[PDB]
Design an enzyme around this catalytic site. Structure first.
Site: not given
Ligand code: HEA
Ligand SMILES: [Cu+2]
Ligand SMILES: CCCCC/C=C\C/C=C/C/C=C/C/C=C\CCCC(=O)O[C@H](COC(=O)CCCCCCCCCCCCCCCCC)COP(=O)(O)OCCN
Ligand SMILES: CCCCCC/C=C/CCCCCCCCCC(=O)O[C@H](COC(=O)CCCCCCCCCCCCCCC)COP(=O)(O)OC[C@@H](O)CO
Ligand SMILES: CCCCCC/C=C/CCCCCCCCCC(=O)O[C@H](COC(=O)CCCCCCCCCCCCCCC)COP(=O)(O)OC[C@@H](O)CO
Ligand SMILES: CCCCCCCCCCO[C@@H]1O[C@H](CO)[C@@H](O[C@H]2O[C@H](CO)[C@@H](O)[C@H](O)[C@H]2O)[C@H](O)[C@H]1O
Ligand code: CUA
Ligand SMILES: [Mg+2]
Ligand code: NA
Ligand SMILES: [Zn+2]
Lengths: 84, 43, 46, 144, 98, 58, 105, 514, 73, 49, 259, 79, 227
Positions: H61, H91, H126, H156-157, H240, H242, H244, H255, H290-291, H316, H319, H438
């Site tokens: 998955h 191009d 994964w 590829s990427s 991580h 990845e 973003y 946008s 943080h993972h 963030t 934006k 999980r």
């Molecule tokens: C697009 C994919 C994506 C994105 C964009 C993010 C964004 C973020 N993620 Fe996430 N995350 C994943 C996909 C993503 N995550 C995936 C796949 C996992 C799992 C991996 C796995 O185990 O398989 C994961 C797991 C993951 C963990 C691991 C936890 C654990 O496994 O125990 C953590 C811990 O810090 C984390 C934190 C964050 C944070 C801080 C952001 C920040 O970037 C978010 C920032 C955005 C905001 C905060 C909202 C907008 C902001 C405002 C409106 C402003 C005002 C807000 C404040 C003052 C707080 N994420």
């Molecule tokens: Cu991360």
């Protein structure tokens, strides 16, 4: 960047060739010399069947599965010890 | 956005057919496998 | 040169809507079906 | 008018609230009587009829503000169709439950649950808020 | 202690690379490598836009430091005006055709 | 050796509708065909190896 | 930037240009509706007279529709503006959208 | 003709088109996998009767949604179609290398599927951590095939990343500064940088895992003095960035879409948007552990990784507010693409906010490896990335095809999806707070209600997926050809008509210096 | 007979925003405060009340008599 | 004069909502789905020892 | 006709053969590691060589013979190459990280020291030092070659380039000999593992680099390069320096510090 | 001197979550101390502390594996 | 343990977990504030016919929307960091226990004094006694003294596992070749459950943790009898 040399007003290929034969290649001769008089050979280390060494978690996929690729009977023991 | 009227209009009856076939192409092969899970589980 | 314009810049034909439908249905349906057949294959392997 | 697809590099007509005076007139070819109307426009506008003023407008513009901003009943179709397909999804769920799922574990039988509840109360599960806090141990009943 | 034997671009460059090299030498820019310089862009002093067909896409950066470019097709004929800042542009023919 | 670059320029700039990977003549075509045959036959064989590996054996 | 009065005057001027052309007329109105205001009657008046010099009756009507559109939920702005422009509308024979029936769907 | 055009392409439009077909097909595979997960969890007990198979299904998955659905569609698909058109370039820089970026994906995907068919598949997660992914606990070819699949996706990427950065730096009109490029182009440039830096590290880490499995190295095996935690570093150092990489192009499309349907000529605070994406790109490289809050790192390391991760909310937030500011004063057209955009903005925020909860290593102890993580990241992916993909797809579908979608059907599709993804994922927060792990094929009885609801919600989204295929057929079957598009003066990609000709910009645009 | 008074015609959008943005804080803060009072303070108070007169031995004893432990009958 | 939504909207709205509610209510309560709700205030504890 | 200076590439079969050849190589390696068969692998290697041969020949046809490499095209190729070197740097970073992680916190199973108990490291002052001097020297001779080329001196360009290639080959023979003599192997715990994989990948890059230089020598013999236009030579020289620098890091970290 | 041993006390040389080196060091210390107190016919009870600490901290299989390796002549620590 | 239809965390059994509960409440309050703010604003942007589609000036409003969130993050991080240091702080344990993960069961070692160890397996569903919990019960519980600081050492003898007990605030991965330490402290006696929390294979879902917390004196008698 300096250490005992000049060159900068009129140069080029000439300067670099100068450095190739006047410095680079002689260093290679010096190191080769330094290598040549440390050669001979070296006392094959004593065999002790240490478990952090001679890892076999899967056979290699050539020969008898137990010899590494650049195996040297003289200095490379198998897991059971040096070969006869 | 503006567009020309359809060159080949797909009528409500034709939509019904397109929709039915689309849904079945997803549901049948999946239903068939899931229906027979136990038969497979008796391996 | 290559054909240009709507319905020509794609590698499948959309000249007949019923043939298109059969095609899409093989295309999307095979991808959807595949995991169910992989699960089946693994169950039947034992 | 008839807009054509090769005209994409040419300025085009839009009706937008925010771009009230588009780049071209809606109608660019004029009949004999329309030309005579454009001629009339050069004179005082008190001399035009209502019908003639209206036609002047329709030559220039396709819809009026009132027409372009009209609301529609589209929402009803969208919401009704959405509900229909959500309701359809329930058929797949009934199907799955009937032909795919076998029985649930015996631990969900009523008697198991009654007993299991008691043991949970015996070990004071979540005694502070979650669970056992909701049982009256003196009166031996769920707190009201 | 130096021979030759290495050909130069002037002797050996061919095709488009040669055309670019030659046009540059005569101060011409037929393959649009350089940014053209604005004129005053009035009715009487328009930006002259070279093209090999009858229309070319102009982008106008109306003021220094705008992040947004305004894009429109310019057609052969009277000068046209950027719809944002009104600077004038007029399409002019060929050259770049040999 | 002598500079034969001008001749090659002449041969590869020749306006015969051929793409660059066939413009050198018969040898391009052979090499192209060989490469293709090995790739497609190799792919077929790797499919065969997959399906063979997908079942349990002795 | 610049003041209310400075803003109104520049616009009044813009549309008063004797030989204003059709492109300029449009550009002026399409720019002005971008702002967070319903334009002062003095500005509309000048724009209407510009339509008159360009012999463009249809645009004069469209300009009035847009004054109404920009007022949004403020129902009082449009009747007030029409009141203030009434001498100009009578002078030039400009009919309102409501008078043409163009306000009905 | 067919072969020269479609197998030998050197054209950015046709190759973007191959990417979109491929990513669509992968998306059906990933969807089917997701429904098998939810069918298994839909009632207590065991459905498949083999948890090795459930582990394989969960693992596949993830690879499929990420490497085969999201990245090819956002970067390969919309990237190739839109980037050259938005900057006036004839191009891509390396049009032939570009075609190889595309052709490596089918063989790569073949290897992924092969892995699930030989032996008992790769039931690893994964993340593919050793010793589980090692040659004892997963003996045989399956994990090796997964590794080779990732190699080819990586290569590829990486070549795609090189092509995008080069094209974007080098093929703009001479007068056009990087500060005049649209936000979608920036978003792809920045994503391409993250890819170039992070994928080789993964490639290194899984190469080490390969040699541990087949060449008797002990990089991750304590018996030779190796360390399983070393793999987690290497993986998350890639991993991580990845995540973003999966969202940035989504940011860029949002946008455009928000700007377009508000009637604006430009997004609010353009440079603040550029700054926010750059800042996200950079901070995304220094937070990976943080993972790993439960692996036994020193408290000062955890204090640092908590703090650096939190700082990401700042750019963030910029934006998010800038999108809301772009709406302010708009002439809002409630098109279907605009509904995807708005639901993106709100649901992305929600997933972002539960990321800030997880960033706390204190609380992460209790939430790590539970369904709260799973709730968190399906919010930003399935209502972030997917929503951006859907909003992009409906917005530019007429540009790619020359035909229009039926708007009403597209709005029905959005409403169904919006309900189903919420019904699926919202209850999983409660599962995680209450302690459900999980990667489990069955759960203690207490967890039944939320799991039941969640599986029901996943069928609703299924119905939307099927309806989407039909909505696409209806467009090609009816053939309503485009005439006019609004706001082309600020949206260069529309200017060559729908669809644009095979070659565009043969004569480049003219842009003055001044 | 009577003219209409001149209404406000500028900054209508900004004026709407001035007002509502206050409301948006009120409501925002409002939800936060409800969460503080109805859940968080309730929580602290539940824990403070539970442990003020708690006796871990009495608790143990009841659990022992209920028969729950392997170690203690 | 009337579009598709004008003629059909009300019928589509009423009948979609009605079908949706019936079938969900039926599915949720008549086919033996185990929801496992809170025993609290619902279940009478029984001796287990 | 175009009036930009960029290259529209004829439709090409090599991307597809390349991709297929990747599928065959990794299928091959799989078949090799688990089923003792090498056929697929040999096939994948064969088709990969043919692909690279033809793809790169075509690039030479498009540039030296057809004149497609205007200054703009050439500017893109510079960026592409620098970017490609950067991704190779991050790839080597992964193995340096593995080395530092293992050697700075040596585990009990190793005796809790670095180098591990039972491991007998090479003397950094012997062959590894000679190897260092060989690659540094070839960095000098290639710079000489570059300047001869720029000054239009065919003879000395060829002579500098030949000396550079010879030093590269010597490095590769010395390294092969060192591998043979080494008293530890890749199966000697994490010390053998980090040592052979990191120096091995480097060894592979020296081979690729030496090949790229040999291709440049032949193109030079055949007069492809002008004194202003020889990007293939420049790219081979960047690549050569990178291989060089990576060696310096290997030497300082693994042979010297890690001994 | 320090009985009423309950368990290994905090050891500021190993203040973090990873305690591997604490088990390890104390194992080495024990066997080093035992070696020395045998070479001079001395009493091994002076080593007892190291033994208690590593008994408390080390998993049985580590200890047991390390003892086998000491016997076999393959223990890789310096004793 | 969790109970049906639970929304939040399991009730705290340790001081640490109670500290996490209040810190969660503080964070969630902020999460609610921001998300409601955003939702109100989106809907404010969409509910008016008034327009302003020309250029707006960005660099005044960007301050607020950079400074506010930095202040907010600081209000979250300060207490977050206080708790983290505390979860780590200087303990003085009265007891050391080891747990070793295996596929698929846990073993336990209590070796301060005698060499006690045992294995701990899930009770299959068909062997459950009435009132017993599906997937949670083990044959041999981890018996420990209530109201005492215990050092838990966690490791594995095979793949990765993770030893967790939500209601104590505990989760420490189990890694072969490594010894991870956590400290455990219960305020109450009773039974507290958890589950393996790092995917370890086929039976990941079936290797649970049961702690049994009792008075010291019962703990000692139980130990002796387990030798
Ligand atoms: C697009 C994919 C994506 C994105 C964009 C993010 C964004 C973020 N993620 Fe996430 N995350 C994943 C996909 C993503 N995550 C995936 C796949 C996992 C799992 C991996 C796995 O185990 O398989 C994961 C797991 C993951 C963990 C691991 C936890 C654990 O496994 O125990 C953590 C811990 O810090 C984390 C934190 C964050 C944070 C801080 C952001 C920040 O970037 C978010 C920032 C955005 C905001 C905060 C909202 C907008 C902001 C405002 C409106 C402003 C005002 C807000 C404040 C003052 C707080 N994420
Ligand atoms: Cu991360
Ligand atoms: C100066 C020499 C230069 C190196 C070239 C030598 C020939 C073999 C080819 C390898 C080149 C690729 C590198 C793979 C890494 C391993 C080889 C390391 C170099 C080496 O040769 O190591 C040797 C053993 O290697 C062995 O098993 C050899 C086994 C070879 C099998 C190859 C393994 C295939 C791995 C494929 C990896 C995928 C790469 C991914 C690409 C990146 C995608 C993004 C050391 O010999 P030994 O007997 O253990 O000790 C010496 C004893 N006296
Ligand atoms: C120019 C870049 C900007 C520079 C920013 C500077 C910040 C980075 C830090 C640099 C590394 C400093 C290392 C010295 C500090 C010692 C730490 C250490 O030595 O940590 C050890 C491992 O480190 C290790 O591999 C260390 C391995 C290093 C990997 C670090 C990851 C960063 C890699 C980024 C890649 C950069 C790419 C650019 C290359 C050109 C592990 O811990 P121990 O002590 O064994 O545990 C002991 C317990 O049993 C008892 O408590
Ligand atoms: C198990 C064993 C397997 C290994 C087998 C050995 C593999 C061999 C690879 C050797 C590399 C050879 C590359 C030759 C490329 C020649 C084409 C060329 O050089 O093309 C040049 C352009 O550069 C260009 O495309 C630049 C092209 C740059 C390509 C360089 C990239 C090499 C990377 C190879 C793969 C790396 C693998 C790393 C693994 C981790 C042509 O332009 P100019 O030179 O200016 O000429 C024109 C003038 O004449 C005009 O007057
Ligand atoms: C995650 C996606 C879940 C999707 C849910 C699937 C929706 C249902 C689609 C229907 O699928 C069909 O159902 C039949 C039963 O209703 C099966 O017939 C089976 O049962 C019949 C009647 O009992 C016999 O007539 C048939 O021969 C026998 O194959 C048939 O194979 C299967 O294709
Ligand atoms: Cu053990 Cu999961
Ligand atoms: Mg984990
Ligand atoms: Na299940
Ligand atoms: Zn302009």
């Amino acid at each position: 960047a300096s250490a005992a040399k000049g060159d900068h007003g009129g140069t080029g290929a000439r300067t670099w060739r100068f450095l190739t034969f006047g410095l680079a290649l002689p260093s290679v001769a010096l190191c080769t010399l330094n290598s040549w008089l440390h050669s001979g050979h070296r006392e094959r280390p004593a065999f002790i069947p240490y478990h952090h060494l001679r890892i076999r978690t899967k056979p290699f996929s050539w020969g008898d599965g137990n010899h590494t690729f650049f195996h040297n009977p003289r200095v490379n023991p198998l897991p059971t010890g040096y070969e006869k | 956005i503006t567009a020309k009227p359809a060159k080949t209009p797909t009528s409500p009856k034709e939509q019904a057919i397109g929709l039915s076939v689309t849904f079945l192409s997803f549901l049948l092969p999946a239903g068939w496998v899931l229906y027979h899970l136990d038969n497979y589980k008796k391996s | 040169h290559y054909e240009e314009g709507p319905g020509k810049n794609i590698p499948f034909s959309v000249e007949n809507k019923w043939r298109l439908l059969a095609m899409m249905t093989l295309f999307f349906g095979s991808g959807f079906a595949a995991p169910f057949f992989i699960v089946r294959h693994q169950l039947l392997k034992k | 008018s008839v807009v054509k697809s090769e005209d994409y590099a040419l300025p085009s007509y839009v009706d937008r609230r925010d771009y009230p005076l588009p780049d071209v007139a809606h109608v660019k070819n004029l009949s004999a009587s329309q030309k005579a109307l454009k001629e009339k426009e050069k004179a005082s506008w008190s001399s035009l009829s209502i019908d003639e003023k209206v036609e002047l407008y329709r030559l220039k513009f396709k819809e009026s503000f009132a027409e372009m901003n009209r609301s529609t009943n589209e929402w009803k179709t969208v919401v009704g169709a959405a509900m229909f397909f959500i309701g359809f999804t329930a058929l797949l769920l009934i199907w799955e439950k009937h032909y795919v799922y076998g029985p649930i574990p015996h631990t969900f039988e009523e008697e198991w649950v009654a007993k299991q509840t008691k043991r949970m109360l015996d070990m004071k599960v979540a005694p502070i808020q979650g669970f056992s806090a909701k049982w009256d141990y003196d009166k031996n009943e769920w707190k009201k | 202690a130096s021979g030759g034997g290495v050909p130069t671009d002037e002797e050996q460059a061919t095709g488009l690379e040669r055309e670019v090299m030659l046009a540059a030498r005569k101060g011409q820019d037929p393959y649009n490598i350089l940014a053209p310089k604005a004129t005053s862009g009035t009715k009487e002093d328009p930006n002259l836009v070279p093209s090999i067909t009858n229309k070319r896409i102009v982008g106008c950066i109306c003021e220094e430091d705008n992040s947004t470019v305004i894009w429109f097709w310019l057609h052969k004929g009277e000068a046209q005006r950027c719809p944002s800042c009104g600077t004038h542009y007029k399409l002019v023919p060929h050259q770049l055709a040999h | 050796f002598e500079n034969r670059v001008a001749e090659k320029q002449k041969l590869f700039q020749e306006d015969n509708g051929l793409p660059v990977h066939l413009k050198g003549g018969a040898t391009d075509n052979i090499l192209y065909r060989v490469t293709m045959t090995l790739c497609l036959g190799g792919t077929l064989y790797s499919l065969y190896c997959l399906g063979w590996a997908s079942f349990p054996h002795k | 930037h610049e003041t209310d009065e400075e803003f109104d005057a520049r616009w009044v001027t813009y549309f008063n240009k004797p030989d204003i052309d059709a492109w300029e007329l449009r550009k002026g109105m399409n720019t002005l509706v971008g702002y967070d205001l319903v334009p002062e009657p003095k500005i509309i008046d000048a724009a209407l007279r510009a339509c008159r010099r360009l012999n463009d009756f249809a645009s004069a009507v469209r300009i009035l529709e847009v004054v109404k559109d920009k007022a949004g939920p403020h129902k009082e702005i449009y009747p007030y503006v029409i009141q203030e422009l009434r001498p100009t509308l009578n002078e030039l024979g400009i009919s309102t959208p409501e008078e043409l029936g163009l306000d009905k769907v | 003709m067919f072969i020269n055009r479609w197998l030998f392409s050197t054209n950015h439009k046709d190759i973007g088109t191959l990417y979109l077909l491929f990513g669509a097909w992968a998306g059906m595979v990933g969807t089917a996998l997701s429904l098998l997960i939810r069918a298994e969890l839909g009632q207590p007990g065991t459905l498949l009767g083999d948890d090795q198979i459930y582990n394989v299904v969960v693992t596949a998955h993830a690879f499929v949604m990420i490497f085969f659905m999201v990245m090819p569609i956002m970067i390969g698909g919309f990237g190739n179609w839109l980037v050259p058109l938005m900057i006036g370039a004839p191009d891509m820089a390396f049009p032939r290398m570009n075609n190889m970026s595309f052709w490596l994906l089918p063989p790569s995907f073949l290897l992924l599927l092969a892995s699930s068919m030989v032996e008992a598949g790769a039931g690893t997660g994964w993340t593919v951590y050793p010793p589980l992914a090692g040659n004892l606990a997963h003996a045989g070819a399956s994990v090796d095939l997964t590794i080779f699949s990732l190699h080819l996706a990586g290569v590829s990427s990486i070549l795609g990343a090189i092509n995008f950065i080069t094209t974007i730096i080098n093929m703009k009109p001479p007068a056009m500064s990087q500060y005049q490029t649209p936000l979608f182009v920036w978003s792809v440039m920045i994503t391409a940088v993250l890819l170039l830096l992070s994928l080789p590290v993964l490639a290194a880490g899984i190469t080490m895992l390969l040699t541990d499995r087949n060449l008797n190295t002990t990089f991750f095996d304590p018996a030779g003095g190796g360390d399983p935690i070393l793999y987690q570093h290497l993986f998350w150092f890639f991993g991580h960035p990845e995540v973003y990489i999966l969202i940035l192009p989504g940011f860029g499309m949002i946008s455009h879409i928000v700007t377009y349907y508000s009637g604006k000529k430009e997004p609010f605070g353009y440079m603040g948007m550029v700054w926010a994406m750059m800042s996200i790109g950079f901070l995304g490289f220094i937070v990976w552990a943080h993972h790993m809050f439960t692996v036994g790192m020193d408290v000062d390391t955890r204090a640092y990784f908590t703090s650096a991760t939190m700082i990401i909310a700042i750019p963030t937030g910029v934006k998010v507010f800038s999108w809301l500011a772009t709406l302010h004063g708009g002439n809002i057209k409630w098109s279907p693409a605009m509904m995807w955009a708005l639901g993106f903005i709100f649901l992305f925020t929600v997933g972002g906010l539960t990321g800030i909860v997880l960033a706390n290593s204190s609380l992460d102890i209790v939430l790590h490896d539970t369904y709260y993580v799973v709730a968190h990241f399906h919010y930003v992916l399935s209502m972030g990335a997917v929503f951006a993909i859907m909003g992009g797809f409906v917005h530019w579908f007429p540009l790619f095809s020359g035909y229009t979608l039926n708007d009403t059907w597209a709005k029905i599709h959005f409403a169904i999806m919006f309900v189903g993804v919420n019904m699926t994922f919202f209850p999983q927060h409660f599962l995680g707070l209450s302690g459900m792990p999980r990667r489990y094929s069955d759960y203690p009885d207490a967890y039944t209600m939320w799991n039941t609801i969640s599986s029901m919600g996943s069928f609703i989204s299924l119905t939307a997926v099927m309806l989407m295929v039909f909505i696409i057929w209806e467009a090609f079957a009816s053939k309503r050809e485009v005439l006019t598009v609004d706001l082309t003066t600020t949206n260069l990609e529309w200017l060559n008509g729908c669809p644009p000709p095979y070659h565009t910009f043969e004569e480049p645009t003219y842009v003055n210096l001044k | 007979s009577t003219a209409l008074a001149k209404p406000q015609m500028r900054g209508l959008l900004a004026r709407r925003l001035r007002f509502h943005i206050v409301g948006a804080f009120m409501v925002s803060l409002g939800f936060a405060t409800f969460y503080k009072f109805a859940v968080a303070e309730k929580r602290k108070k539940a824990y403070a009340d539970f442990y003020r007169n708690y006796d871990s031995m009495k608790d143990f004893e009841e659990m022992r008599k209920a028969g729950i432990f392997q170690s203690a009958k | 004069a009337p579009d598709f939504h004008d003629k059909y909207g009300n019928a589509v709205l009423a009948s979609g909502a009605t079908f949706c509610v019936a079938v969900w209510v039926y599915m949720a309560t008549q086919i033996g789905i185990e929801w496992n709700p809170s025993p609290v205030g619902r279940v009478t504890p029984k001796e287990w020892r | 006709h175009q009036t930009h200076a960029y290259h529209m590439v004829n439709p090409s079969p090599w991307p597809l053969t390349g991709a297929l050849s990747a599928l065959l190589m990794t299928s091959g390696l799989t078949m090799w590691f688990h089923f003792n068969s090498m056929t697929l692998l040999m096939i994948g290697l064969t088709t990969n060589m043919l692909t690279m041969y033809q793809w790169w020949r075509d690039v030479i046809r498009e540039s030296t013979f057809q004149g497609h490499h205007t200054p703009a095209v050439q500017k893109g190729l510079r960026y592409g190459m620098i970017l490609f070197i950067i991704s190779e740097v991050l790839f080597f970073t992964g193995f340096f990280w593995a080395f530092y992680h293992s050697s700075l916190a040596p585990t009990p199973e190793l005796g809790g020291c670095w180098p591990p108990t039972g491991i007998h490291p090479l003397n950094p002052l012997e062959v590894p030092l000679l190897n260092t001097s060989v690659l540094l020297a070839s960095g000098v001779s290639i710079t000489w070659a570059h300047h001869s080329l720029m000054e239009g001196d065919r003879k000395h360009m060829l002579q500098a380039l030949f000396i550079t290639i010879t030093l590269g080959v010597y490095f590769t023979l010395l390294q092969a000999s060192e591998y043979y003599e080494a008293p530890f192997t890749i199966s000697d715990g994490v010390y053998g593992s980090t040592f052979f994989v990191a120096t091995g990948f480097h060894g592979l890059h020296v081979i690729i680099g030496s090949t790229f230089l040999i291709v440049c020598f032949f193109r030079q013999l055949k007069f492809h390069f002008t004194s202003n236009h020889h990007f293939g030579f420049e790219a081979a020289a960047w690549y050569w320096h990178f291989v060089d620098v990576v060696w310096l890091f290997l030497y300082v970290s693994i042979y010297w510090w890690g001994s | 001197k320090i009985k009423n041993y309950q368990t290994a006390p905090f050891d500021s040389r190993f203040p973090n979550q990873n305690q591997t080196r604490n088990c390890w060091q104390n194992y080495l210390d024990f066997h080093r101390c035992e070696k020395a107190m045998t070479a001079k016919g001395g009493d091994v009870s002076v080593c007892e502390w190291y033994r208690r600490v590593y008994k408390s901290l080390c998993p049985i299989s580590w200890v047991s594996t390390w003892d086998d390796r000491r016997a076999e002549g393959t223990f890789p620590g310096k004793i | 343990m969790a109970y049906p239809m639970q929304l939040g965390f399991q009730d705290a059994t340790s001081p640490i977990m109670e500290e996490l509960l209040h810190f969660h409440d503080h964070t969630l309050m902020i999460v609610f504030l921001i998300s409601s703010l955003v939702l109100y604003i989106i809907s404010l942007m969409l509910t008016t016919k008034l327009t302003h589609t020309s250029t707006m000036d960005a660099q005044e409003v960007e301050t607020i929307w950079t400074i506010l969130p930095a202040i907010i993050l600081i209000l979250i991080a300060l207490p977050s960091l206080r708790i983290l240091y505390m979860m780590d702080e200087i303990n003085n344990p009265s007891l050391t226990v080891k747990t070793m993960g295996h596929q698929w069961y846990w073993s336990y070692e209590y070796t301060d004094y005698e060499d006690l160890s045992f294995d701990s397996y899930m009770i299959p569903t068909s062997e459950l006694k009435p009132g017993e919990l599906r997937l949670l019960e083990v044959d041999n519980r981890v018996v420990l003294p209530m109201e005492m600081t215990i050092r838990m050492l966690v490791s594995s003898e095979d793949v990765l596992h993770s030893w967790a007990v939500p209601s104590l605030g505990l989760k420490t991965d189990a890694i072969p070749g490594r010894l991870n330490q956590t400290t455990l402290m219960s305020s109450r006696p009773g039974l507290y459950y958890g589950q393996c929390s790092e995917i370890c294979g086929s039976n990941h879902s079936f290797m649970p943790i049961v702690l049994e917390l009792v008075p010291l004196k019962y703990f000692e008698k139980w130990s002796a009898s387990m030798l």
